[PDB]
Ligand binder design. Sequence first.
Ligand SMILES: Nc1ncnc2c1ncn2[C@@H]1O[C@H](COP(=O)(O)OP(=O)(O)O)[C@@H](O)[C@H]1O
Ligand SMILES: [Mg+2]
Lengths: 131, 795, 131
Amino acid sequence: ESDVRIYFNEKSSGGKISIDNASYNARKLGLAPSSIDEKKIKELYGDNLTYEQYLEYLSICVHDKDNVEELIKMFAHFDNNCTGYLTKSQMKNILTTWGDALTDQEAIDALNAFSSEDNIDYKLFCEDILQ
Amino acid sequence: NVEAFDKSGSVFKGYQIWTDISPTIENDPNIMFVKCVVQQGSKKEKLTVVQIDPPGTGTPYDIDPTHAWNCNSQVDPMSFGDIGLLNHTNIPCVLDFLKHRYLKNQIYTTAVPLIVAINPYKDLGNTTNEWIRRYRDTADHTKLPPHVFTCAREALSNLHGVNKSQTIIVSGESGAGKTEATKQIMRYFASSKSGNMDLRIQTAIMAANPVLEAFGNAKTIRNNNSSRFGRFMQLVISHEGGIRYGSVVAFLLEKSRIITQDDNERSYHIFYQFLKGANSTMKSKFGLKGVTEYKLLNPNSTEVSGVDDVKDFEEVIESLKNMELSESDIEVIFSIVAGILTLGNVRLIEKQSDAAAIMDEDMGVFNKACELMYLDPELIKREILIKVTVAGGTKIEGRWNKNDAEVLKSSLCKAMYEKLFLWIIRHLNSRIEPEGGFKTFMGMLDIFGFEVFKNNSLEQLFINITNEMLQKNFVDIVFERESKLYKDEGISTAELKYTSNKEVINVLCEKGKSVLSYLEDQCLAPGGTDEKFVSSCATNLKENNKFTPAKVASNKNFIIQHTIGPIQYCAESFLLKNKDVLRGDLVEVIKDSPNPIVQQLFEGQVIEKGKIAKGSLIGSQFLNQLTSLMNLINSTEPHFIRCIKPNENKKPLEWCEPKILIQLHALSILEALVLRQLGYSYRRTFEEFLYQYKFVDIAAAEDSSVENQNKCVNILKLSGLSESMYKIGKSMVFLKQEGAKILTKIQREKLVEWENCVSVIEAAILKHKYKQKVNKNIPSLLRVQAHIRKKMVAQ
Amino acid sequence: ASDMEEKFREAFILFSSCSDHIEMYKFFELMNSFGIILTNDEKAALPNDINMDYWLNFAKKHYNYEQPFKHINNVNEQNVQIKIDNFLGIMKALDTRLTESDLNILLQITNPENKSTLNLKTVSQKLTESI
Ligand SMILES: Nc1ncnc2c1ncn2[C@@H]1O[C@H](COP(=O)(O)OP(=O)(O)O)[C@@H](O)[C@H]1O
Ligand SMILES: [Mg+2]
């Protein structure tokens, strides 16, 4: 709650903070912001936000409906034999193609961070990122 | 047999096959077959493949063509409900189709006239009120996936539609899902569109499943809620839903379970329910000890995971009340249960070693047991300890030894329980049956399917006899129906004939020349053993190939050649297991009870003066029950629900190819496809055939100068198909399976010009369909990416 | 200038279930989806284990940028209309992967009305707008 006002000042400029910096702060606090949450606030207050708006943005960044069952949906979609396991190559192609696409490096990094093996238990991979 | 090569003799690039040869198969008991691609250069006499599914090494290997099966490549299993509609119906194909549907949570799949239902071992929420309503009120039922409600709808539709009685038959292995299906179908029948005035009679029928499961079900190794008996119901449902009348029949209750249980196996639920569930006042009233403190109850097995006996017990008390039992009636039921449990805890010792008697420590226990069971304790003590032999001419008052008196005590516990259970049913029937009986009813049989074990006894024999009667029902209704169809269109019913199990029925039932006829005669014999019974059977049943003796223990074991294969039975204790019925004088002591319910337990039970009569034995009595039950079912129109247990682990999304295939064989799911293919299988109306096979010959099709019955005969003669593959019919063009498959190949040959265009069209539409599904999961993906980035900041 | 790489790459992973190798049958679905057609010899000449980089190269070499879907209708020929239920007749006759739903979707997207005939010059036209 106080970290919100601590992190704000560090990246703030004349009382207002950029969305890119406001989003970074949300991650530091432990929130998961998508291009939707950013396009949501951009649609309401522009690119630079006051302290009043900053909180209102971190309010949207609160994703409670987030759980393994909700996240696995896409990975589960390509697990045609229903094993609960996907290759690193499979998962890299998903993360780097659709949605708020990650760099072919960002994807490799995060999958290599979770496991050494090519076959990744995406239920566990998702449980881990959520923590 | 795998059309892998072109005319040139070169393999089709990418040609996929099914195969029984792989290291995956060797290393995994779950997998029976793998997907392969036929490698370029493969020979006609021996193929070279590479595994593609499940993923492999990439290593090419050789297989003899007799280990290659056709693949149903490019086919959506969720696109249609019947296995028969598949281009290839070989074992690996049928199995895969069933697998894909299972993992997508579609368990029900037909194999006309059968409905296969794979146990999901997970709540799918497909039998909710929302699902009953959908299945009940839908315009065109066919535009809905297969379901047990499909069968319930159809059955109630024919009953009311043509005023013919119907019988739904649910069968399969222990834990395959018979009882659950039975409970769903009933739940559907109880859902009325606008209401039910006969709600009291319906409420009582629905209150009967918890009651029947409490007293008749048990936790076996194979099922935590195993039906230890055969259930038959007659229902009277209103055309708009709602049960009005009913009749329940239990049969072949597992007597042995009341006395002793194997380990990791419990007794009947009610014992556990009642002891953990009875309140402080109830416990003192009967003098109840803990579940562990009872002899008749395995003290280790006592708890079952996911089963809350205290909560289940509350539900039984309410169910008994809803069956129109008074508080007194209920109190009498539980006094008899406390009696059965207490009597078991009485100890007996040898009184030298000559005769036997009650342990003095246990005299109060014995007396309480009789009081609770509303029986005379002195007269009960007398029957358990006084032997009245008839040596020479006269009666000789003697005494029973420890082992014999232990057996007579156990006989009482068993008989009292079984009879209480049957009385509960008899009482329910008194409040739910129609006064003049049933005109047109809806039959429902929940019977244990064909049984094969490491050792088979009299228990499995009676089950396999019942299952032979039902298979006869299947094959007869398969014939009857397909035969009436041909006849209606004026076609030769000659090339229509298939196998009858009449040969194995005679060897098992027929009076004078059957295993059951010689089992009865040996029990009635003044000196007959299990050896004498097998020896007499192996001598008098040489006329039919269905009776065969055994290699190891030739006089102790015998093997019958059932429809589903050879099943070997062990004749040890067969004579003992048939004679297990209460002994005449003890029955009089019970019938002389002051209490009206205890008197009612053995109503009109004739006295056993001499040695056991014909109709006293289990085998004899059961054949009478079965014949009566059968004739009643043969009178109705049947419906078959086949249940498949997919794994021995009671786990969801766990497919086991081998187990599943034994089941496809035992339930005749495979033979149901075989029968549907035989003869003139393709049958479609003159208008239909012409929409379908239009392009075989577009000239004869696109013509006003000829009628529809004549447009078809023109196309067919011009086509190439021998008159040996097609018959014209009255309303329908009757084409043999082979003929109808050739005819399609001719049509495609004509539209050779359209091939590249339709390829591109279809392919582009799929690419689109594909991206659309990916869009659905894009908001969820946005989440995995938001968090991957959140996690990256924290470093 | 028109770089289809992003569209080709995505399509391969739609058919290949996000893996980096497609099986032959699925590669044939894939190439067809871009209007590519191969002769039985051209096909027999393909590598048995097709991968992403192979496809991307092939796609550039065979995709008709000037006119994709030339196989539905050629602008260089001339004779392009046929009845609606006739088209479906041929579709069903050639054992399509498509269901009664997919077929009807294609129909109201292309044919605006219920106009007696379906024009192929429009089938190709609408599919190219959906590339
Ligand atoms: N349709 C189903 N959906 C969910 N669970 C089921 C279904 N059918 C069976 N089960 C599970 O399997 C168990 C055993 O099935 P059951 O129908 O009682 O056995 P049986 O075939 O011996 O009558 C059930 O108690 C239940 O937990
Ligand atoms: Mg059961």
